[PDB]
Amino acid sequence: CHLSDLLQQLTSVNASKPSERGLVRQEEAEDPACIPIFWVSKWVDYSDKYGLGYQLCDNSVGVLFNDSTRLILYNDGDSLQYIERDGTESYLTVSSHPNSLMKKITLLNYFRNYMSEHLLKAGANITLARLPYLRTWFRTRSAIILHLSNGTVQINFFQDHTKLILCPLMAAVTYINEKRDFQTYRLSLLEEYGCCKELASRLRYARTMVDKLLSSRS
Amino acid sequence: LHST
């Protein structure tokens, strides 16, 4: 889950009140060695009927269906992984699949084509192993919260289009601002050096969202 | 209903 480590890391940075530094040195908290491998570059909320489709920054695609099963298409365009509710994984391809999966494969194909023709790709200015899948997601009035199977939590804010990619394994957070600058910080260094009021506010929201994920599981 |  790693959610508990993330909650600890966020409560700690927020307790340091990072936007009340006599001198904020936010740039000094950047750490290129913590750039995340995976984040969600596009998503499509079709959850009143089928579910939530998304694209990862490596151009792989996934759907978390409303029955809480998952189908992941690797970025070779053919290799598939199916994950049942309990997490049981099967490996298959579009060319060779059980007929029971035809409907769900058809739906993933619709999502994938749409996200290849339409949306802007978050983090596109930044460059077949274990792909994470979408464990859970929810949306508020101000944001959509995405929880990946490798423990990263991504929060996309609707009103100003900024995004947080939180990785508890590196104890790091990546902030994509309005201008689509992509900046990766070590959370302990934001504790040390501070940050602007805007990012401090998103990090406060982030803690509350991680708390929600922890209080919501299974 | 879809991203940025």
Residue numbers in the entry:
A (entry chain A): 372 to 498, 505 to 595
B (entry chain B): 3 to 6
Which text from the study accompanies this structure?
The Polo-like kinases (PLKs 1-5) are a family of serine/threonine protein kinases essential for cell cycle regulation and cell proliferation. In humans, PLK1 regulates key processes during cell division, including mitotic entry, spindle formation, chromosome segregation, and cytokinesis. PLK1 inhibitors target either the N-terminal catalytic kinase domain (KD) with ATP-binding sites or the C-terminal polo-box domain (PBD), which mediates interactions with phosphorylated substrates. Among them, PLK1 is an attractive anticancer drug target owing to its overexpression in various human cancers.
We designed and developed NC1, a PROTAC combining PLK1-targeting inhibitor 4j and UBR-box-targeting ligand Arg12, acting as an N-end rule pathway or N-degron inhibitor. Among the PLHSpT derivatives, PLH(n-octylphenyl)SpT (4j) is the most potent PLK1 PBD inhibitor. To further confirm PLK1 degradation resulted from selective binding of PLK1 PBD and UBR ligands in NC1 via ternary complex formation, the crystal PROTAC structure complexed with PLK1 PBD was investigated. The PLK1 PBD ligand in the PROTAC interacted similar to the potent pentapeptide, PLH(n-octylphenyl)SpT (4j) within the PBD crystal lattice. For example, the pyrrolidine in the PLK1 warhead of the PROTAC interacted with Phe535, Trp414, and Arg518 within the pyrrolidine binding pocket. Additionally, the long alkylphenyl chain at the histidine residue penetrated via a deep, conserved hydrophobic channel formed by tyrosine residues. The phosphate group of pT engaged in polar interactions with His538 and Lys540 within the phosphate binding pocket. Furthermore, an overlay view of the newly synthesized NC1 with PLH(n-octylphenyl)SpT (4j) confirmed that the ligands project toward the binding pockets and interact with residues in a similar pattern. This finding showed that the PLK1 ligand in the PROTAC is capable of reaching its target and maintaining activity, even when integrated with a linker and an E3 ligase ligand. The crystal structure of the PBD-NC1 complex identified key PLK1 PBD binding interactions and isothermal titration calorimetry (ITC) confirmed a binding affinity of 6.06 µM between NC1 and PLK1 PBD.
